[PDB]
Every structure is written in structure tokens, then in C-alpha cells.
Amino acid sequence: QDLRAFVHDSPEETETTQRLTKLLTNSPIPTEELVNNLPLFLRRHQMTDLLSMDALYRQVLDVPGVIMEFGVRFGRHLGTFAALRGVYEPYNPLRRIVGFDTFTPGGYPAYLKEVLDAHECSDFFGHVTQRSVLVEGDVRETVPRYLAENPQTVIALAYFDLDLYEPTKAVLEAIRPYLTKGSIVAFDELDNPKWPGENIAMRKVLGLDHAPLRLLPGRPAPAYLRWGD
Amino acid sequence: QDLRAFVHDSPEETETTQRLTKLLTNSPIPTEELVNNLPLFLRRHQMTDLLSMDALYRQVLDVPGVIMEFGVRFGRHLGTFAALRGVYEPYNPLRRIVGFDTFTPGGYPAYLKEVLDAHECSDFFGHVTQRSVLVEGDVRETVPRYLAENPQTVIALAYFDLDLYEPTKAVLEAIRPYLTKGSIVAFDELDNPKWPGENIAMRKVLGLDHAPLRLLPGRPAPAYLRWGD
Amino acid sequence: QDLRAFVHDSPEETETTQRLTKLLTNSPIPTEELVNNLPLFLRRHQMTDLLSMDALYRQVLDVPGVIMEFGVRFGRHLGTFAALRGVYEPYNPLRRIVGFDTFTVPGGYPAYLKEVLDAHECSDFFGHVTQRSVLVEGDVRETVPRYLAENPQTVIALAYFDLDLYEPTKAVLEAIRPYLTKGSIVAFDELDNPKWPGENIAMRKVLGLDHAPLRLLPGRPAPAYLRWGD
Amino acid sequence: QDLRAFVHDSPEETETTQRLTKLLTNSPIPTEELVNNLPLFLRRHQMTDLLSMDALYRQVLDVPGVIMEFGVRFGRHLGTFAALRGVYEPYNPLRRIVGFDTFTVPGGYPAYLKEVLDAHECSDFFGHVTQRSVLVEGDVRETVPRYLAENPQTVIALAYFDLDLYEPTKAVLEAIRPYLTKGSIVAFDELDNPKWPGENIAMRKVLGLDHAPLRLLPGRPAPAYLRWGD
Amino acid sequence: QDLRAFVHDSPEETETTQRLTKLLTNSPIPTEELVNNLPLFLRRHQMTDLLSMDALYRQVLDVPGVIMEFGVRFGRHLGTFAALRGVYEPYNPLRRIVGFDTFTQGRFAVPGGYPAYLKEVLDAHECSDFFGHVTQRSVLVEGDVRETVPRYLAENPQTVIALAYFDLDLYEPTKAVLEAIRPYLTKGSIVAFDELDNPKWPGENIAMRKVLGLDHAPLRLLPGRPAPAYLRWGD
Amino acid sequence: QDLRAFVHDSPEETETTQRLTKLLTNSPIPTEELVNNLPLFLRRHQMTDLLSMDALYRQVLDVPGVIMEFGVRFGRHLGTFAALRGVYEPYNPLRRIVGFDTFTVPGGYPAYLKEVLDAHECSDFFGHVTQRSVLVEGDVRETVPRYLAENPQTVIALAYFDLDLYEPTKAVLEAIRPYLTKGSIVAFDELDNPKWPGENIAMRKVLGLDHAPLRLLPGRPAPAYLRWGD
Amino acid sequence: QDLRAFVHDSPEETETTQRLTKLLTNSPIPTEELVNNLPLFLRRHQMTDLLSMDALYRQVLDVPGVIMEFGVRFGRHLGTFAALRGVYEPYNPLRRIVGFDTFTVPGGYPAYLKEVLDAHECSDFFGHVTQRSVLVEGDVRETVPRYLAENPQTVIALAYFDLDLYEPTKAVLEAIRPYLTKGSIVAFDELDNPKWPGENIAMRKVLGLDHAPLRLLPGRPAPAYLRWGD
């Protein structure tokens, strides 16, 4: 197997990343102004991800329910969604953001919860708790349990970043009764040769023509569908 | 004069900013992954600014010419534009980004140029130089000089953050022959009680009904117009 | 359980509400002019409810039939619908407004609410036609089927659910279904609210959440509403 | 039963109607010019009905077939359709207008109504083609199936139901179905009216209220109409 | 059989083709500049084919997956797709281009056969792609599609097919490939045919009617052009 | 001056160009089939120019008149226009293509280019009409006014500027203006290019950059084009 | 001068025309059915002209006034307009068709052409109103101003120019201008044709080519037409 046939960073993309890291860590900007200048260090590749999450969020502003991410890494998308919920939905305390991951750095979920709490403390409904929830464990156990604990659930946006067949299949099967027509289901690596399990699960549970799978033009991921279309 | 009648941060907005600063500077994320997770620390207020710059940029993707910012602070908008030019215009080496400021930390323009060079080194046209330019000095001298040196100039997007009457007036007068119908002219504080000089200049040079001034809904700034409309 | 995870008023929202109450009841406006100035006392949160009911009504102006609310509280929505019917439908005497509740509020509250609705109706263009507002007291599991049996002409243009609980919500969904047309609106006051999961459980039991497209009016957590047949 | 809960004329609507009757029948307008000034005497309520029939007709200008009215009263809609066919379709001799009624009106009323329709048709571009207006006298349960058997070329573009009762509405809905296309309009004069529930009972029996989207013309309680196949 | 009832070149079309060939190979343009002036030699008929492929590509820019061509001739469409992928998708390394064919100077046989030359062509486009460091973004598969297409899909379970272009002529291969690709299409994928309604090659139509039916989805032309005939899956 | 601030080819773009040149000229494709496979050798950068010329042409299909190019290099755009005219306009013998250049390329290059254009034209539906392609050799400051004086029927649908310099660009803009209609396209190959500022200086002198809306095809630095009168 | 640079028929177009002439004049179709089968003999080129006139007429169906043709040849367009007026406007007796020509055609040709137009009009819905088709014989420089003086009610909805020459085109453009409204169509048969530059010279003299947007119907070299006021 030729590893070069998998997506990987060019030398220039690596150079850009390393330079921006160094300029962030050794910045003459006053430390208390760094979080007012983060776009200085946000290169094309990561800007694109932010714009894509914005695009998905904007498609469910007229859909009830919660946002769920299955596979969260360090929380990039969860921070994005917390900020965007401020931009678009000051008066919606029911738009819960739920992140599922095994999380295996230690004690990282506690840090990430501190980050999400910091966004939430200036929300208009910051007095309502449990608007951001991190669920630690294997999704084959935690997603059914979360849903059993939350029979009020409607899912407006479901973001899949699980990579593997068995967990992707189990979660697709579990979330289906909580979707409405217009709910968005999005995949981080549906058609990526490195991680074929997501496609295999999609074909097993639903079929690739169950609904129209779409790209945001110019961007290889995410692939996303509108339920019922 | 009651200073509370000017826009200022709420205690919660300050708390969010301070918390996110601390979580950025004391982060368990591996240092070389911070620039892959900047949305964790990008609160609503600053996300909104990014989305607004994206919106303005998207309105000039079918307009020739350069992007100019008059008054640049630490360069937040210049970094944003450098990344967005990657997202939208890999094959446009003529979309120069020009920032004008007195810049008065010392040697800061050199740092900011290092930042912009770091984005540019993975651009498709990264071999073409002078696609990002910082012009140091008073805009009443530097903007006419830049234009005299660049008679090829068309201005697609002009962003005003000068605050004061005399420099805003001088730059509006200087850039006018380089605009086309469809060029965007945007103001950071047109209708803000703290900085009335921008409005006074706009009314002197053009008139507030010269073209339709618009907001992005929900956002008090920028105010922007499409030339010729 | 943490009660802070349920929606509740901020201290600032409570303060606004208490202040506006005091200014309404201690007003230098002449008594006979208060009802010409009620927006002085209509705060954001309640203004939003009004605009939402107007948006739902405007979606059924080309749909025949009646408006039903299942769970009416003090009658806020029924008064809204009575005024909007005047705004949009002076010539439609068949747009009946039917409110169902146990009314368990002061005793004799239904008679007061009926007097309020009659006061709107006496200046309607069709104010001489009776029974254009109906309050039905009792358990919706009996009263909604009984109302429909008594009214076989029924078509339902707008059905608004504020019943909270599984059994009543399930029984009413099942009963109203033969009286909906494609384009009828079915709306829910607390479909996705952790405090009252029975509404969702009943919707998933009877129809399923993807039976039709559930929507929000952007920026507002409720109502959630669907257009039948879409 | 409270008869004021059925739609009925206000005193003012009665006054307008009686005054306009007097002014029509005692007019200083020369006799031969009265039929050039009928809008003087066409009040809101009746103008609304005319505008509604025009709206329904305009929706079937690109649909083949005939117009049928089941229950015709004195013929108001048939005259309306005869004139509108002149406005919109001078070159379409296949747009037959067929009215079905028992005519149980003065005696010999159908012959009068036929004289009226012939008077419109004698200035039609295709006035030399006969049987473009047909009055079919009898119980629709017998006459509509017989008409369709005699006319196997039939396509129905617009079907207007004003039969009031369950058994005839059901029988005619069942008989006309094979002659509709997608886009044909089916319209009801009293689908949701408390006075005449049989029309609704029949619609629910034969098709279901959500078989197709039932619509109003906004602001008007009737007709309720659907586009076949939507 | 009257062979004039099959589509063939007019004398004037032949004349144009022969003249432009002469002017291409005997040109005062410096040889190193010819690839900057190819439109001088690209006549209407061939320009039309290029515009048609651009129209099909533009319809799948918001559809995930790969581009496949079944029956590739000298590779005209594969080169077009490689250039167009540059135009529209610099940042999409997952848009693989896969050409299937049996592949069965001027006088010396090419070592490795025509596929070795055509791979050289596609490599030449890819070395200036923004994602030119990711390999296997263009793939040629030699052999009988009845075997090679199922094998390729078995080997590539991540596949989604955004654009499937059929130029196989015959019933049995067209039927087999239609059957194999179906689980990999989404609603909005484009399936296109080079000779669906062509008297010379009825097997393509026979296979379409057998597997799907001509009214499975709406078959369309680009107006004014007899081919391709194409459908949007699920419409 | 830093020559790196002017647009120039990356090493990878040079490599692609050289490789495709070698594969074109050492091809196992039969000689008489090369012109059926030129897209094998048409790289991104040149494909983009073709799609841009097609987009401009498609915007003048409902505009009368001719196509003019001022500065033609080896004739790339003229060949493109000749093929596109076949694609879109088999029945329009009045869509003349006029190329103006000094032709200072090998000597006798205009005769070769004319032979190329004639080869396209001999299979056009109107190939029997002559002078549908015209090459005008000389200084545009004399030749464009002379062409227009000789051709008072002229309407200009598309004017494409690739003259680089101030004086020729200014003279041609001034000359063509009476032959444009609202909707004519005026396009520039290097309006905002630091290497050739005279084009911009001339546009600002004659018309001004806001005389009409200058546009890009998104993602492409050139051409910049305006629709006259907008 | 190279006469092959003017538009002219190909050998194949001549062959089609001559063959269809023979088949029209030696047809086994019964004589009285020939005028029911004329499309058998209506080739592409002439069909295109008919479709163009239909397109221009359809653009003025919501514009008051008359149709004028300046230069009428044997009357092809006048017959086309007479038929299209039947298709689209049975109830508009004010849509006069006026043809201006010197008729310098066989002798007495205008009387023949009038018989043809009367033959269309005798089956028009308003066939009893005379002077709905008018042929005005003479030099347009005299006849058009005289016609307008005799007809101060004139509004011009569509003006079709086929005069070829500068002086008559200029004079008629100047005379008709006060009778156009915004939306009136002005159309030219040879505005950009090298054979007849005088039409363009006149347009540039009186109005300028950018006075309004000149358009083609795509794929057709003529007519070129503008919507007044755009």
C-alpha cells in the first residue's frame, strides 16, 4: 500500500502550520489581546472547516432540536458551534450541543468543559445549565443511554467523525427516530480511502441514495444530507 | 458626558474573554495542535467579525482589483483576508491585500509581515511576491503615494477604520477614481457616537444617500455600500 | 435533578416583568386609554409569542377550517387568534376558534374568558353569527372526540398543542387526523423541552418525528410546527 | 339548536340587498342600457362570488375538458362561466358547461335558463356549434352516470359541488373520478359549513380530507377547492 | 443495410479536419508554444464535446465521490476531466478519475501499450495540481469491465460515484457495469451515455431498458447536441 | 524592481507545459486523430482561458454585431471564437470576427492564421459567405478608425482588449464607442495588472472605472469585462 | 467589391427552394386543401422569419397601439401579423396593421395585397370594423407624416423597418418618435448588414446605437430590435 495515495499535508502546508505556531507562541501582541486576533493564525485549511460548520449550522436554524458530534478530537467543532449559537440563537436555550467521545490526554473532558463554560457565561441564557454536554465512553453504550435519558430529543444536526463501521452503524441506527425531515446528517470521511467503514455503514443502514449526499463546493468534506430529501 | 452611553463590554463579555485567554495560555492541547483548534478560543463577538469579513469578501469575488484596509490595529482583518483569499481565489495572484497604518509596539509591521508571509507560502501563487503589503505612515501621505506608484489599481474592497474626519475624508477622495460599480466601501464606526468623524467625512465627500448603506442584519458594524447602487 | 437545566427566567427578565406590571397598574394614562397602549407593557418575550402566532395564522389563510388549541392556560393565544381573525378574515364566519382545557385558574374562569372573546367578536363584521369562539371544558381524551362527533363539517386548519403529557397528546393527535388537509398546520408548544417529554414521546408513537418537516421560526425555541403532507 | 350559529345576513346586508333591488327595478337608466350597468347593483358579497369563479376558471385555462356544476340554484355560476368562456376562450368549442339539478325554481325554469345561456352563446366565436351549454334535469345519482355514459370523450377540468347532502355528493365524487386529470379542480360550496355537514362526510368517505390540498381563496369562506393530484 | 443512415462526417467536416491537421504539424508557431494555442486547431465538433464535459462536471461540483469513464478511446475525456478538476477543485484530492478500458511511432509499438502513454499524459496534468503530492488521483484499469469494475469497487469500499460516463457500445458490458455501480450512486449523481439512442450501437439502450428502464429517471440532452444523454439519479 | 511581483509561471506549471508539449509531438495517436484529442494536452491554465471566452460569447448571443480583438498574439482567441460561432450561431453570417495586430511572430504569420480560420469556416453552414474572418495588419490607431469608416454597418457585440499600452488602448476605446449598444461587452486582458498599467490609465482617462460595472468570472484574475450601459 | 461577402443563398438552399416550389405547384393534394398544408412547403429559413415575427408580436400584447411596417416587399410580414392578430387578439379592433411602400411588384399589386388581408379579416371577430389593415402607397418621407397627421390617436406598439436606405430610415425614425411609449418595439431588418449600411448610419444619426439595448433573437442575424425606454 502506497501511503502517498492517502490525503496528507504538502511540505508547504506543514511549513505554514509550523510558522504560524511559532508566531502565535512568540507573539508581540499583548497576551490579553491574542483571543481578539486569532484569525492571524487561522490558515486556509482551518478557515475552510469553520466556514463549513457555519454553513451546516445555517441550514438548521429553522429546525428544532439539538446538535450532536460523534467523535470530537480536541473539540474544534464544539467550540465553533458554541460561538455560532451565540451569533444566531441568543434566545434558544433548547439548542443543546452534545459531544460523544471515548477521549482516549487525561482529564481533557474537564478542560474542554471549562472552555465551553467560558463561552456560555456570556450567553443570553447562560443561567440555564446543561446546554453543552460531553458524554465520555464508547458510543455504542453512551448514545442509546443518552437518548433513553432524553426522550424529549429532536436531532437537528448530527456530525459523524467515528471512522469505523461498527460505531457508525450503531449510532446511525440509534439516532434515526429522533430526526425530522430537514435534519442534517454529516460525515467527516464518507468517501475517504483511509476510512472506508463510514461508507460501508452508510450503505448497510440507509443506502447512499437514501437521500442526496452533498458537498460544499470546493471542499472534499463534509459530505452531508438533508433527511427526507 | 456619561461614558456608559458608549459601547463597552459587559462584565460577562469580559469574563468570557479573560477565561478563554487563560485556557489558551494554559492548554493541555499539544502546542503544535493549537493552530488546529483556534475556534475553541474564538468567542461570539470575534466569530461575528470573521463572518462579516467573509460576507464582504464573498460580495467582491466577481469584482476585479485589490483589498485595502485603512487602520489595521494588530492585523485581525488582514489575517482573515489572507486565509479567505486561499479559500476562494487560489488562481488570482492580482488580489493584493494592502494595509495602511501609522503603527504607533515597535517593529510590529515586521511581525505582521511574517504572519502574512506564513499564510502565503502555501498559496498556489506563493511564488508571486507583493501580494500582501503593509504601508507604514500617515494615510494622507501614503495612500496617494501608493496609488501614484500603482496606476494599475482597481479597488474591489475598501475597509475604513480610521476614526477621524480628516484622514477618512482624504482617503475617500483619493480612492474614488479606482472604484468600479460593484466595489464595496465599508466603515467600522460610521454611526457610532464615540467616533463621529467618519460620518462627518462621509457626509462631506459623498452624502449618506450617495449609495445604499447596509448592515449585515444583527450586527451594528460594519456599515457598507456597493458603489454605483 | 438540576432544576437549572430547565428553562427559567433570568433575574433581569423577572425584573422587567415586575416593573412593567407596576407601571401598567399605576399608570397616569387615563383608564379608558390603557387598552390603546398595551404595547408599552408587552416585553420582548411576550412580543415574540405574538409574532409567532401571527406567523402561524398567516400560513393558513388559504386553508379551510377551524383553529383549535389544546391546553389554553389563561387564554393568551385565543385572544391573539380572535384579534388576528379580525385583521385577516373579516368575511370568514366559518373560522371558528375552539379552546379545550380542564380549566383547573379560578372557578368560573371559562365564563370570564368567553366574555373576553365575546368582546372582541361584537365588533367583527360577522359578529351576529354565534359560536365563532367555543371553550370546551373537560379532559381532551373525551371532549375532543365528542366535539368532532358533534361537528362532522370540521376541517382543522391549525391545531396548537400545549398539553404537556403523553396520554392527552397521543389521544388528540389520533382524533384530529381525519380532519386535516395537506397544508394544515400542527404546532407544538414544548416538543423538545426536557421538562415535558411526553409530547415528543406521543409524536414519535403516533406519527414519527420525520412524518413531516418540523420547523422553528428562526431564533425561537418554540413553537415547533409542521405542514401536513409535506 | 341555535340558528344564529349558522351563517346568515346581517341587517345591513339585508338593507343593501333590498335597496339595490329597488334601484335596479326603478332605474332612470334607459331599459336597453340596464345590462350595460349591472355592476351598479352587484354588491360586495356577490362580486366576491364572481371573482372566485374567475379565479377557479383561470386555474384551468391550460387543462382540457368541460366544466360541471352539481346543484345550480337559479344559474348564477352558469351565466358567470358562459361569460368568462367568452373572455378567455373564443376559440375553444370543446369547453362545454354542464349544469345538473333537479330544478325543484318555477316550472319551466330550465327552459328559461337555457334561453339565457343561448343568448350569451349567439355572439360566441363558435356560436354555430351546439350543445356547448347543457342543462341536465333530474337526480344526479341517475343523471351524472348517464351523462358520462353518453359522453365517453369526457375530460373534467372543473367540477363545482353545491349538492349539500351526503348521498348525492358521494355518488357524484365516485362517478367523476375516472374523468379527472392531474390539475383538474374539484370545488365545494359548503365543505366546512355547520349547516350542511354531508359534503364533508362524503369527502372523508370517498377520498379523505388530505387526499389533496384543500384551499380557500384568501378572505373567503367558500369555495374550498383542490387541484387533483397535488 | 444503407450505411449512410449512420452518422458519418460530411466532406466539409473531413476537409476541415485534414486542413487543421496540416496546419498543426507544419506551423510557424514555435513548437513549445503549441500547447498554448490548441484552440486554433479545435473545430466546432470537438469544442462541443469539451463544453459538454464541462457542463456535466459543473453539475456534480456539490456531489461527493469519483468520476468514472467506461470505454475511454484515446483518453480525450480523461484529459478534459483532469484539466477541469484543476479549474474547479484544487482542494479536492478525493475526486479520483478512473478510466476503464480493454485498450485493444507512428510504427514503433509503445512499450506498455497505449495505457503507458495515457498515464504519462495524466501525470503531466497532475504535477501542477495543488494536491499533486497525493497519488492515485487518476487511475487506468485495463481489462474487461465485467470483471474490472466489480473488482475495483470491492477494492474501494469508500467509493461514491458522482459521474459515470458510458461509452461501451455493447449490451453485456453496459448491463454488468450499470448493475455494479448502482449501490455507489447518490441522489444527484450523474449517469451519462455516449450512444444511448444511436442506431449503430443499440446494445446500450437495450441494457438501459433491461436494468432500469428509460423512465427510471429523466434522460436529458444538452440542447443542440445529440449526445451525451444523461440523467440525475433519483429525479 | 522585483520581477517576482509580476505574475509568472511556477516551476510546476513550466514542467506541465513542457511535458505536454513532448507528449503532443511524440504521440502514438495516429497523426490524423491528434486534432480529435487536443484536450489531452490542454492544461488547467489554458482550459480556463477557453471557458472564459465561452462565457463572454454566451453573453452576446442576443446582441447584434461583430467580435473584435485588439492584439491577437498567435490567434488563440480568434480560433476559439471561430469554433464557438459554429457551436452557437450556424445561421448568423453577420457575426464577423475581426482581429487587429501589428503582427511583429514570423513574417507572413497573418496568411497562416487566415488559413487556420478559413479551415474552420469551410465547414460552417454559411461557409460560402466570405469575409466572416478578417485580419487587419497595422497600428490600431490608424487601422481601427479606417476599418470603421469602411464598414458603417458596424455594430460591436464584443470588444476584447489585449493592447498593453496607453496610447493604442485610448485610441481604440474612443473609436469603438459609437458602435456599441447597451449590452455590448467590453473586455480587458490586463486591466489591473502591475506589468501593463497603461490599459487602466487609458480606461480611467476615456471612461472612468465606474462608467459601468467591471466584473471578473469568479476565480480568474482576467478577463475584466463590463456590459455597456449597466 | 467581392459580392460573396454579402449574404446569399447556398446551392443547397436554392435547391430546397426550387424543389418545394415544384411540389407546391404540382401537388396531388386537392386544390381546396393546399392552404391547410402550407407548412409542407415552408422551409427553415422562412419558418424562422415567421417565428421571429411571432416573438416580436408577443412582446407587445400588453402595449397599446398599432403595427407599422416600412417597406413591405410582397407582404409576407403583413399576412403574418394578420393571422397572429387573430390568434392573440380577437377582441382588439384598435390593433391596426399599416404597411407603407412605394410598391415599385406587378402593377395593381397593392389591390391584390388588400384582397389577401381582407380575406383574413372576413373571419375576424371584429371583421365588421373597417380600416384594420391599411396599405399606404408612396414615398415614406411624404406618406408617414401624412398618415400621422390624419391619425392623431396613433400609438405605435411595433415599428418594423425594411427601407434599406439612410434618408427614408432617418425621416421615419424622426416622425414616429412622438407616438412610441416605453415598451414599444422598434425593429430593423438590416441594421448591421454590409449590403445596406444606411439603416445603421440613420440609427446612429437620430438616436445612437446605445440609445436603447439592441437585441437579436438568438441564432438569427435579423431582426435587430429594441424596447423603447430600456
Author numbering:
A (entry chain C), B (entry chain C): 7 to 110, 133 to 257
C (entry chain B), D (entry chain D), F (entry chain B), G (entry chain D): 7 to 110, 132 to 257
E (entry chain E): 7 to 110, 127 to 257
What does the paper say about this structure?
CalS11 uses S-adenosylmethionine (AdoMet, SAM) as the methyl donor. Structural flexibility and dynamics are generally key for protein function. The sequence identity of NovP and CalS11 is 20%.
The general fold of CalS11 is stable in structures with or without SAH bound. Superimposition of apo (red) and complexed (blue) CalS11 structures. residues 111–131 are missing in the electron density. of CalS11 shows enhanced mobility in the absence of substrate. binding site is more solvent accessible when no substrate is bound. completely exposed to solvent in many conformations. distributed between closed and open states.
